[PDB]
Structures are given as structure tokens and as C-alpha cells.
Amino acid sequence: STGSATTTPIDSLDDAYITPVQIGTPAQTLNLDFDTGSSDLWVFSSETTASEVXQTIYTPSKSTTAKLLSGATWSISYGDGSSSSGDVYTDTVSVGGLTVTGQAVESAKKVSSSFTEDSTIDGLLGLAFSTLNTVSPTQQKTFFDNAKASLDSPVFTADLGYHAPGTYNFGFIDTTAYTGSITYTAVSTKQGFWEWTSTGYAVGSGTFKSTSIDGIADTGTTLLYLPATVVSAYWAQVSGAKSSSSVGGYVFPCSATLPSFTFGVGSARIVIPGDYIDFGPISTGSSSCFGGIQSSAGIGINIFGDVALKAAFVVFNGATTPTLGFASK
């Protein structure tokens, strides 16, 4: 089997991407953020504290296939400090025509304020390794892990758009979705992430510096977070750019033409167009824009978030030894 679903930016800034997911019988369609940086499929629900719901909710008592996972609970917090918790059902979950039975669907009893405040995100579908799942006492498998037995190939691909719809595919590689060839690179699962080592970078038309950058491919992070020295090298080529303590990162004049940023995948190179590194105005009508490449020093992990990933066709190869592939597009 395979599945193919359209993923859409939630807003004009490409802050996040949502993908429809059908849960239960009859299907309840929720728009979830597919997050390769976590491993829980959780949803706003009929159990969620009413004052914390503003979203489409899952109602397990309306699904004939929902089963309570007795005694199971979950609690998660994310890199941006958001959080949620609740209890656990198993149910039928379909993405893009690919159906998994017995998927753990974590039903939120409570969600943090940023979840309430974001009308467009009805929950998360985690696609990191199942060792990060937060269900206790027994961790639950991701949708991808449960699908692998039936998939035509144990892979999923992310094809995120720049201010445009894109695609998540499960079980196959669409050879018409990218140019050149895919280059694969090794993945370490020691921290549960799609963690890999970039071979280096270049700014604009300058030289490629071979410097190992250990980081994660995270569809659930908006920006590209890289080492401070790398980020400084990038913004040094933008004459108006400066770090702003009050705004919380590099800011620059919206009228600037930004250089591209190239990162290495083995011998291959992925080029992020300059425009992709313009995240957008700090407020509507501002002359100042926030940078799409920021220092990872405060997070402690380098993160190839959506600014990077949307410049590529990205293959998440979930064979027993996983690998990560990148192609230009």
C-alpha cells in the first residue's frame, strides 16, 4: 500500500504545515502537524477542557473502532515549551488513503495556551522514532512504524512548499517530484530523532566550508537553527542584518536581497534560495524582517527545520538501519 496527502502552510509565513488525517469510524478528519521531531499522535478531543478548546476535535465515543488503552497516559512538551497530556485510544487512522488499524490516538485532556491560540492545528502526528513516544506504561508506535508492514517500501517523503501546498507520501518515492538524484546519509537514532551530519555549508556564491554539522531533520520546526559561527557567517553577507536581543534573533531590512545558503549532504549540495531565508516582517507593514536562519545555541541542537526542508525533496527511509535522503527540486 501507499498514501499521498497534501500538506498546507497554516499561515502566510509558513510557520507550520498541516495535513488531513482521518481518525475513527466513521472517519473524523482533523488537520495535524506532521512532526519528524516527536513521536506522539495526539489530538484535540471531546475530553479536552472546554475553555482550552477554541479546532476540530476527535470524539472517541463517536467512533465504533475506538478502544481505550486501559491504564495508559501521556504527557509531552516541545522545544518551544508547548505541552499537552491525556489518555489513549487505539483506532483506525488513515493518511492520504493509507489506513492503519490499531493506531494509538492520544486524546488530550488539556493543552497549553499556544495550542488553544492556534486555530489551525488540531493536533500532532509524530514521525520521529517510537522510542520518543510519551505513553506510559508502554510506549506506542508511530503511524509510520505501524504502516511499515503494509507499505510498498518502508519510507515516507516530505515535499514542503514555499508559501505553497506540498505533499507527504508514504510507501513510495515520486521520481517526478525532484531533480537530479537523491543522496542518502546516515542517521543516528541514539536521541530518537532523524539525526544526521551535514558535511558543511556555503553562503551565497562563496566557498563551501567542510565542517561537520550534527543536526536533526524536523518538519515541526519553522526555521533553520545552525551553529552560531555558521549563522554569523551568513548574516555577515547581509548589510542591514543585526542580532536583536529584544526580537530574539537576527533581523534585517525586508527590502534586502538575501544570499542563498547551501548545505552539504555527503558530496551533494542543497541550495536554500535567499527568499526562503526571509521569514517575513516582524509585524505587518514593518520595514524589519526576521531571519529564517538563526543560532542553535539556545536550543542546544542544530535543527534543519522547514526553511531548509522546503528547499528539498526529503526521504525518510525507515528500514531497520534508517537513512535520510535529500534531492534538489
- Pick between residue 95 and residue 303 the one whose CB is nearest to ligand 2ZS: 303
Q: In angstroms, what is the minimal distance from the CB of 193 to ligand 2ZS?
A: 7
Based on the residue annotation, tell me whether 15 is a catalytic residue of this protein: no
Exposure string over 19-55, b if 16+ CB within 10 A, otherwise e: bbbbbbeeebebbbbbbbbbbbbbbbbebbeeebbeb
Q: Single out the segment in contact with ligand 2ZS by CB under 6 A; choices: 180-188, 206-214, 218-226, 239-247.
A: 218-226
**281 near ligand 2ZS, rule: CB under 6 A:** no
- Within 10 angstroms of residue 83's Cβ, the number of other Cβ atoms is 16
Residue 52 lies near ligand 2ZS (rule: CB under 6 A): no
Q: Does residue 15 belong to the site contacting ligand 2ZS (CB under 6 A)?
A: yes
Q: From edge to edge, which strands make up the β-sheet containing 278-281?
A: 242-244, 249-253, 288-291, 278-281
Closest CB 11 distance from ligand 2ZS, rounded Å: 7
Would you state the cell numbers that stand for residue 22, as one nine-digit string? 482521518
Closest to ligand 2ZS by CB, 15 vs 177, is 15
288 is catalytic: no
104: contact with ligand 2ZS by CB under 6 A: no
Catalytic option among 39, 84, 85, 198? 198
Which of 13, 256 has the CB closer to ligand 2ZS? 13
Q: Minimum Å distance from CB 175 to ligand 2ZS?
A: 28
Residue among 179, 154, 172 at smallest CA distance from 312: 179
By CB under 6 A, is residue 40 in contact with ligand 2ZS? no
Q: Judged by CB under 6 A, which of 25, 67, 68, 80 binds ligand 2ZS?
A: 80
List the grid coordinates of 251. 533581523
- The type of residue at 288 is S
Q: For the stretch 168-193, what's the b/e string if a residue is b when 16 or more beta carbons lie within 10 angstroms of its beta carbon? A: bbbbbbeeeebeeebbbbebeeeebb
Q: How far apart are CA 294 and CA 251, in angstroms?
A: 10
Residues in contact with ligand 2ZS by CB under 6 A are 15-16, 33, 35, 37-38, 78-80, 82, 114, 118, 121, 124, 218, 220-223, 299, 301, 303
